Structure formats: structure tokens, C-alpha cells
């Protein structure tokens, strides 16, 4: 059994789409609470007085659905560490607005991305929102296993890709997260949603992550290989990383469009269920200790 979620940036009708993904086999949905292209100005007129409503209505779903089925998503134009002052200011206002709306709705988690190196002003705004108002909403930082730049295709003739192995340059994304987390003073409310790319990085990178608070793991459809029949599958090193994560017990999330148009979409999910059932079986220590994981007891003083 595996807790599973679907990611989208396009949801025209919330009722319809939520039903369709739930019928696929998914436990929850990651959507934007605002339209990701609906850019909003807070300072300059005339755009700041744009007439409402700014987003869809909370009544389209029950308190229970917002609490157990939806996961917020910060709009992608919200960039608080922009080099442009006006942009940083609007993005701070927009972040607070989207995160406070998620708190209003009661969302169990809320997604935010670590896609560049400097996320300092982003961290601060989050820290402030954490400390302002009484809530327990969680925050899933979307950080990639290999950075976009370190994954691009070597097709730029006059700016090639560094083919020299860099030990600490391949650990770039971890430091994005270590910095963000250190700036927020290790909040229990801040967790990592680890994005998994097409080509996995050297084993050391993978090893320096499972000490961290992973609550979700993100798999795009583009990494799935096709097998003999026509179903989506995964290489053996990717499968090994999966086995690790299910041991560390996380919520998997599928993103991207259907690339295997011969079979429906629940096939990716079924592949996940497959591996879950077909995992190395639990021994007597693993069966018995289960439930005590990372639980701190004062030590026994039998004198």
C-alpha cells in the first residue's frame, strides 16, 4: 500500500478534475490555489486595483476535501529573490497572500520550490508566515535531485556542459536545501519534496539525502521507460532509489502529461503499487521495531 498524489498546473474545474484523479487511484492532489498565470500587482496603479475575485471559491469543496485531498502550490511567477526590486516586493505580497489562503482553507501541505541557489528572501517570508498566526500546515520544498542546469542537453555550441566530474558541484541542490532550512532555524513544519530527474547522480548525492526530512518524492512521467508490452516502468537504479524511499516511508507524487498514450494514466500508479508489494520482505527486527522509528526515549535507569 502506497500513499500517492498527482501534480498539475491546470485545473479548469476543481470538482471534475479531483474526481477524475481520485478515480484513477490517487489519494490526493497538488494544485495551484491561484491561477499560475494570473499575475497580480500590489503597489502600482492601475493594475493594483484589479477587480476581484482573485481566485476560485472555498465553497467548491468540503472542509474534509481541503484537509485531506488538496496540496497547495505557489504560483511560478512568485519570485522573492528576483534582482528587480519591484518584483521582489510584489512576490513577497503574493507569497503571503497564497500561503495565508492555504492556511484559510486548511491545507495539509503547501509546495514551494528551491530551483535556484539564493532562496534567502523566500525563506524569510516563510519564516514570518510560520510565526504569524496559529497553524500547523506543512511546507514541502520542491528541490531537484540534479539541478536543471546540470541536467540540460549539451546542445549550446558556444557554452558546453562541464564534462569534468565535480564532487561538490554535484551536491549543489543539497546545499540549496541546507541553506534554506538553516535560515528557517530547522522548523519541524518544513520538509523536503525531492524531485527525481531523468539521469540519477553519483551514489554519494543520493546518500546525503536520507538523513533529511523527506515527506514526498516526485516522479515525472518523462523518466519512465517503456517496457515490452507498452506499460511505463523504471530502470534498476531508479527502482533501488524507490525501495529506499518506501523504507523511509514517503508520499509519492506523479507529475507531467501522459507520455504512454496506449495505456491510461493509472498505469504509473500501478507500477508503484507493484514495487511496494514486491519489496524485500520485512524481517523480525523490521516487523517488530516498526512504529518505534526515530522515537526518543529517556534511557532506562533500573537501579
Amino acid at each position: 500500500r502506497v500513499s500517492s498524489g498527482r501534480d498539475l498546473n491546470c485545473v479548469p474545474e476543481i470538482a471534475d478534475t479531483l474526481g477524475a484523479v481520485a478515480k484513477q487511484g490517487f489519494d490526493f492532489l497538488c494544485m495551484p490555489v491561484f491561477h499560475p498565470r494570473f499575475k497580480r500587482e500590489f503597489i502600482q496603479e492601475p493594475a493594483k486595483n484589479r477587480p476581484g475575485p482573485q481566485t476560485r471559491s472555498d465553497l467548491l469543496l468540503s472542509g474534509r476535501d481541503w484537509n485531506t485531498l488538496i496540496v497547495g502550490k505557489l504560483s511560478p511567477w512568485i519570485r522573492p529573490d528576483s534582482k528587480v526590486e519591484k518584483i521582489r516586493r510584489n512576490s513577497e505580497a503574493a507569497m503571503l497572500q497564497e500561503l495565508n489562503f492555504g492556511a484559510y482553507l486548511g491545507l495539509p501541505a503547501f509546495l514551494l520550490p528551491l530551483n535556484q541557489e539564493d532562496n534567502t528572501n523566500l525563506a524569510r517570508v516563510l519564516t514570518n508566515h510560520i510565526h504569524t498566526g496559529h497553524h500547523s500546515s506543512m511546507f514541502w520544498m520542491r528541490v531537484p535531485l540534479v539541478a536543471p542546469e546540470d541536467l540540460r542537453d549539451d546542445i549550446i555550441e558556444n557554452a558546453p556542459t562541464t564534462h569534468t566530474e565535480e564532487y561538490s558541484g554535484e551536491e549543489k541542490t543539497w546545499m540549496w536545501w541546507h541553506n534554506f532550512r538553516t535560515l528557517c532555524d530547522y522548523s519541524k513544519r518544513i520538509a523536503v519534496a525531492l524531485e527525481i530527474g531523468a539521469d540519477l547522480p553519483s551514489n554519494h548525492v543520493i546518500d546525503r539525502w536520507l538523513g533529511e526530512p523527506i515527506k514526498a518524492a516526485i516522479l515525472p512521467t518523462s523518466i519512465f521507460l517503456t517496457n515490452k508490452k507498452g506499460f511505463p516502468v523504471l530502470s534498476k537504479m531508479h527502482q533501488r532509489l524507490i525501495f529506499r524511499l518506501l523504507k523511509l516511508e514517503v508520499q509519492f507524487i506523479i507529475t507531467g502529461t501522459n507520455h504512454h498514450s496506449e495505456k491510461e494514466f493509472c498505469s504509473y500508479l500501478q507500477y508503484l503499487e507493484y514495487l511496494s508489494q514486491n519489496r524485500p520482505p520485512p524481517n523480525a527486527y523490521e516487523l517488530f521495531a516498526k512504529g518505534y522509528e526515530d522515537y526518543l526515549q529517556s534511557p532506562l535507569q533500573p537501579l
Binding site: 491546470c10 491561477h35 476560485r56 541536467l151 549539451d154 546542445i155 549550446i156 502529461t257
Partner: protein, 304 residues
Amino acid sequence: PPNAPACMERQLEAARYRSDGALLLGASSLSGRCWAGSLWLFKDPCAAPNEGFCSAGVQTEAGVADLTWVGERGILVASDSGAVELWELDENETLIVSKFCKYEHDDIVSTVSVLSSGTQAVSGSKDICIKVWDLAQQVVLSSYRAHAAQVTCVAASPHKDSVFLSCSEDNRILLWDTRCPKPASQIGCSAPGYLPTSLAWHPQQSEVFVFGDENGTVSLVDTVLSSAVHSQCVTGLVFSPHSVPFLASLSEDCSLAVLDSSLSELFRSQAHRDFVRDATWSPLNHSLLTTVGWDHQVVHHVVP
């Protein structure tokens, strides 16, 4: 008109004139219970945006980030769904039907441009992919991942099928030649500046183009010369159909400007009340310029 929807969505994203004089507008619903899109054809432009006084209307499944004319009946659409869809005009030019809707991108499709051939197109997305499409075959010939951030704009050269521009939130401007085994080649400043956002080819010099950045500055380059035109991001740039063309610039400061060739401003309009999204020049009256914004306005300007 039959099949038309009763209401067109408040946020007008794109507006493009056809050679005869028809206005194609594409609108997206960015707020409210339903987040969809719509395509409309107005053989009379001064009638826009009345749903009752249109020549043809239809509604797509999702918002319309960008579109462009494919000939005189085809319409290329960049859907939030992650799909590039081609809708074609009826024989009588009263209806609009989806010819193909291909879901190849893993995130909002934000740019489409048609190559000089008219049988091939190129799309940019927020998934960091650029795809080259065969409109005939309805499949993707090539899928390039050259950028390190969301692809903001792609603009196909007006005369070479192999050559097109792209710019991304990774501070990169690329020039592409599908004939090279490393198609893309990086243009730009010696030092990191502000993110590029809009690309416009020049209609008469095949190696010259203009780009506008997120800070509101427009620049002219040859494979220097720049002016701070807007206070905010430059969302688009469009050249006039004149013998010596005028440059139209659009911004998120709800203003439009028209520049010459030394990028000296000549026209200035603030009639729009929300982001001024797209601008298209009249093929009949060359001193006439139509603009659409998120304030549901279709505004026509008399340019000197």
C-alpha cells in the same frame, strides 16, 4: 453565431490580424470557478469584444497562454494543459473546430511561433522544453532541453525554417539553427543583466532582432542601443507592417509605447486599465494598432 459561447472570459491574452482584415482574439479565464479558454474571430474589429457581434466562436478546455495564425484558417494554441492544439476555420468561416490537440509538454505551454514554411512550428513551455512540431504530421519532430528555467518566449525567424529565437528565465537568449548538431547558440551581455521576456525579429534584416527584459528596457541586437521604455516587464514587442517599421511595446504597467528605429518613443497610450497583453497591426490601415488587455478592452490606436 452557432457554437459560440455566451460569455468570453475576462482576460484577453492574444490578438492577431489576418491578411484580409479579420481579428482573431484568444481569451482565458484566470479567476473564478472555471478556468478555461476561448477563441474568437471578428471580421469587424470595432465590434470586439461583443459575443453577439462576432463571426465565429468556440471554447477550449483550458486557458490560452498564446496563439498564432497558421495560414488563413489554422490557429495554433498554447494551452495550460500542456498541449499544443491546432484549431481550423470552417469553409464559411463561421465555426472553429479542433484539428489536433497533442499533450506533449509537462507544464503550461506559454509560447508558440510558426516558422517561415508554415508547415512547422515551435513551442516553448514552463517544463523547460522547446519542441519543433510538424503541423501536417501532428507529431513532434524534435524536443530540445537547452535552458535551465521556464521558457518565456520563442520567435521563429521570418525567412529561414531552420532558425528561431528563444529566451528563458535562465537569463539566456538562444539563436537556433536546426542544421547544426548543436543547434542553439547563446547570445547576450558580457555580464548577467535582467531576465529577458520578449523577442521580436526584424522583418527586413535577417540577423537583427529586439528583446525586452523584466525591468522594462528594450534592446536592439545584431548577430548596444537600448532604452528604458517601461517601468515594468516588457510582455511583447511587435513590428508594424510599414516600409520602415515601427516597434510596439507592451508591459505589465498597463501602457503601450511605439518606438522608431533609434528606439525613441513616438506614441504613448494608457487607455488600458490592466496588463496590456498583445498588440497587432492592421493590414489595411497601417497607422492603426489594436491592443488587448486583462481589462476586457479591445482598443484601437491612431499612430502617427
